[PDB]
């Protein structure tokens, strides 16, 4: 109950490493959203929904990483 | 494990919820839509 718990925590860390991609992903989605509404103010009502869609999908990927970490924590 | 308490029960639940929704609640919205269309036309 010593090495197994140790590698459990280590693997939890190696799984939480993945939220970087989700963060940069929601970032680039919001970034292109900003650029799109910048080029055309009038397309905001159309580009908002799929942008928050992409944010949700990337956040769900980050929470997949978090779930992989959590089964290695509880 | 303790699986024969929520999965099949959950299936019965979403079946009956789908039936209740589609047969009751969507028709009210449809009825109000068509009534507004009729008294607007």
């Amino acid at each position: 109950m010593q090495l197994v718990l140790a590698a459990k925590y280590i693997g939890a860390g190696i799984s939480t490493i993945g939220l970087l991609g989700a963060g940069i992903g929601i970032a680039i989605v919001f970034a292109a959203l900003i650029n799109g509404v910048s080029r055309n103010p009038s397309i905001k009502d159309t580009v908002f929904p799929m942008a928050i869609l992409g944010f949700a999908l990337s956040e769900a990927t980050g929470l997949f990483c978090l779930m992989v970490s959590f089964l290695l924590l509880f | 494990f303790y699986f024969m308490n929520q999965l099949t029960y959950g299936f019965l639940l979403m079946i009956t919820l789908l039936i209740l929704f589609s047969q009751f609640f969507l028709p009210m919205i449809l009825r109000l839509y068509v009534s507004r269309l009729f008294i607007s036309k």
């Binding site: 009502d45 159309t46 908002f48 929904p49 | 028709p27 009210m28 449809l30 009825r31 109000l32 839509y33 068509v34 009534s35 507004r36 269309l37 009729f38 607007s40 036309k41």
Partner: protein
């Protein structure tokens, strides 16, 4: 048509008309609703022309 205007003057439930009353008055709208329900075409042609969507999408 004087009877019509006299009724419309003080019997116009713009914000308090009962949908059940509307269905009972005209069975034609009921017939249309069941026909289009059983047909499967849930569209009601000409419904976004005058009614908004406020769609977050």
């Amino acid at each position: 048509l004087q009877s019509t205007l006299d009724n419309i003057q003080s019997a116009r439930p713009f914000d308090e008309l009962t949908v059940d009353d509307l269905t009972k008055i005209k069975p034609e709208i009921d017939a249309k609703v069941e026909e289009m329900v059983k047909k499967g075409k849930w569209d009601v042609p000409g419904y976004k022309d005058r009614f908004g969507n406020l769609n977050v999408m």
